[PDB]
Design a protein around this ligand. Structure first.
Ligand SMILES: *[C@@H]1O[C@H](CO)[C@@H](O)[C@H](O)[C@H]1NC(C)=O
Ligand SMILES: *[C@@H]1O[C@H](CO)[C@@H](O)[C@H](O)[C@H]1NC(C)=O
Lengths: 50, 48
């Protein structure tokens, strides 16, 4: 799974089966990292109009 | 993919199914890749 974003701590109580999370666009918004099983939230990098 | 979803609920109703809502969490995602068309459940006898 490829993508760009800032990986941050999260407070979403994922259930054991649950691995990733999806937004309205179906783009991944949270992911469970392998090896360490922690849940990292994926927040798109800051952007806007110059 | 043979999916087993399971839920355990503490109930106190005597005869029929209780009326309510309980979502079944996925328990086992099983990689078998075989044909299944017929099933049979297993019970346990009591001997005295
Ligand atoms: C390796 O990944 C597994 C999960 O697939 C995890 O249980 C285990 O702790 C990991 N080991 C190391 C050394 O990261
Ligand atoms: C499964 O078995 C039934 C009869 O045993 C057969 O009609 C059916 O085509 C089979 N399906 C597959 C995917 O093999």
């Amino acid at each position: 799974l490829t993508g760009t974003g800032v990986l941050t701590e999260s407070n979403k109580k994922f259930l054991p089966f649950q691995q990733f999370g999806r937004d309205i666009a179906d783009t991944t918004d949270a992911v469970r990292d392998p090896q360490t099983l922690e849940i990292l939230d994926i927040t798109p990098c800051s952007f806007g109009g110059v | 993919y043979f999916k087993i979803y399971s839920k355990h609920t503490p109930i106190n109703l005597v005869r029929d199914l209780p009326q309510g809502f309980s979502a079944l969490e996925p328990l086992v995602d099983l990689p078998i890749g075989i044909n299944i068309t017929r099933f049979q459940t297993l019970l346990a006898l009591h001997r005295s």
